[PDB]
Amino acid sequence: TCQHPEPLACPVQCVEGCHAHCPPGKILDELLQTCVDPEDCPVCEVAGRRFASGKKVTLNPSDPEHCQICHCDVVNLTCEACQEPG
Amino acid sequence: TCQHPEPLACPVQCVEGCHAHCPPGKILDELLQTCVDPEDCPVCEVAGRRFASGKKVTLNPSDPEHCQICHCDVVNLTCEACQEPG
Secondary structure, eight states, X not given: OOSOOSOOOOSOSOOOSOOOOOOSSOEEOSSSSSXXXXXXXXXXXXXXXXXXXXXXXXXXXXXXXXXXXXXXXXXXXXXXXXXXXX | OOSOOSOOOOSOSOOOSOOOOOXXXXXXXXXXXXXXXXXGSOOOOSTTOOXXXXXXXXXXXXXXXXXXXXXXXXXXXOOOOOOOOO
């Protein structure tokens, strides 16, 4: 989905219920109930690598000197500065 | 003195006691009990201006961008780098 573009660990094979079926070239987002083209997803790709659609997590806690954080809210190709402990 | 080369605010005019009197061209230091020539004082003059004999104070707290600190322990013509807050 636009919210979960990546595949997830899938404990359940399939499930009942209402399922939005529309032709390809369109990915489902729940807020705008219909399916929509992929580009309309608020998807995030900062410094190249593939990941989720801008999860709200502060990556890289481990190393202070390598504290090179890059959040993404919806679309922004931004990177934030780390506050030094010293 | 070598420790207090500058004149100080002097609440008392004069005082009793033992007083080291020796000819001029020699300034008193208390550690080496006698008076000694001025150059032997661990005196400090960093970037030109006249001040004490290297007081152990971190000058210039006010402005971060102008944080241009210059300590002097005894003799060194050194200046230390300020740690940035960002």
